[PDB]
Amino acid sequence: KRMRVIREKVDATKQYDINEAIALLKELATAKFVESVDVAVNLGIDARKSDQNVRGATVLPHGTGRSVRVAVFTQGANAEAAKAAGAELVGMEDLADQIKKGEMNFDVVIASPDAMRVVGQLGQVLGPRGLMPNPKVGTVTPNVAEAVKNAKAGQVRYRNDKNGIIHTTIGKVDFDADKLKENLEALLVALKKAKPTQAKGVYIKKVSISTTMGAGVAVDQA
RNA sequence: GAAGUGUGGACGCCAGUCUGCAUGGAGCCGGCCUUGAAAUACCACCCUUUAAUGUUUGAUGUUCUAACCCGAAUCCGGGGA
Numbered sequence: 001k002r003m004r005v006i007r008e009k010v011d012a013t014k015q016y017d018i019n020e021a022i023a024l025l026k027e028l029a030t031a032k033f034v035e036s037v038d039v040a041v042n043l044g045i046d047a048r049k050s051d052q053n054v055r056g057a058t059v060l061p062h063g064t065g066r067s068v069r070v071a072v073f074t075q076g077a078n079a080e081a082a083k084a085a086g087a088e089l090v091g092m093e094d095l096a097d098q099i100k101k102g103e104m105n106f107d108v109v110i111a112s113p114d115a116m117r118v119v120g121q122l123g124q125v126l127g128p129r130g131l132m133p134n135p136k137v138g139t140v141t142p143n144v145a146e147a148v149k150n151a152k153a154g155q156v157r158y159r160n161d162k163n164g165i166i167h168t169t170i171g172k173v174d175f176d177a178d179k180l181k182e183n184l185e186a187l188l189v190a191l192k193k194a195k196p197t198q199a200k201g202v203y204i205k206k207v208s209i210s211t212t213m214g215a216g217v218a219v220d221q222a
Numbered sequence: 223g224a225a226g227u228g229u230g231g232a233c234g235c236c237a238g239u240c241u242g243c244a245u246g247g248a249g250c251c252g253g254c255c256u257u258g259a260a261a262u263a264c265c266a267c268c269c270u271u272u273a274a275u276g277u278u279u280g281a282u283g284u285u286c287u288a289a290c291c292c293g294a295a296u297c298c299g300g301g302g303a
Binding site for chain 2: 001002003004005007010011012013038040041042043045046047048052053128129160161162163164165166167168212213
């Protein structure tokens with residue numbers, strides 16, 4: 001398999017460093033278009049417990065302003081307030097089907113509390129990409145009209161799901177070695193600071209810099 | 223972390239791919255990637271179950287063996303956990 005040429009390049013036993021990772025990373029992205037790299041690390045926290053969850057944002061290395069395509073989901077009169085607001089895409093719970101069909105043409109998604117449980121059920125697709133509206137993120141609130149306006153002000157959110165560890169998009173392979181590593185470190189630093197107090201033991205059991213699809217490489221967070 | 227392929231095998235009973243095996247045609251990865259009766263890619267949740275192996279451990283049945291009981295002066299014999 002083309003893995004043959006991708007395996008001889010990576011050593012599953014060896015734990016490469018940050019700088020080294022990015023280097024080997026580029027040659028592992030030999031494919032079509034510009035590949036997007038991600039960073040997955042193992043967290044040692046009690047899943048179920050809410051106080052164990054880790055969520056936040058890190059100032060990584062473009063794409064804010066009138067260009068950003070907002071998608072609001074409200075109910076009742078809140079729909080009109082969103083339209084006159086300036087939201088490109090507006091609608092109720094009915095538009096929760098089209099997105100499910102394959103429509104993803106949008107950058108940010110705003111919505112109201114009354115329609116959070118219904119959207120939550122369909123948060124398995126927007127959850128990983130950090131497109132799921134949230135209170136702290138200032139994405140969910142009655143005054144949606146103000147939300148969309150306050151937008152275009154400038155964050156890569158990170159969370160968890162139902163399968164294992166945690167990750168986030170670091171950048172693309174086209175980027176230089178210095179740039180990429182410059183991001184990997186920033187993300188790790190923003191993660192260790194998000195470590196819950198109750199969490200005991202090794203927070204990051206194992207770090208691994210791997211693109212969307214490209215020979216997973218384990219690295220040292222330090 | 224060579225198996226994928228198209229006709230090739232196993233230790234507890236049923237299928238998708240994995241390794242030191244052996245090779246051709248099936249194309250180099252790929253298979254993969256728009257057929258009704260044979261159909262899609264990424265990090266806690268009912269499985270998270272089941273199946274197998276090693277260690278610790280609970281109950282039952284068998285054999286053997288030191289306590290105990292009886293016979294005998296003793297040796298020892300009979301019975302027997």
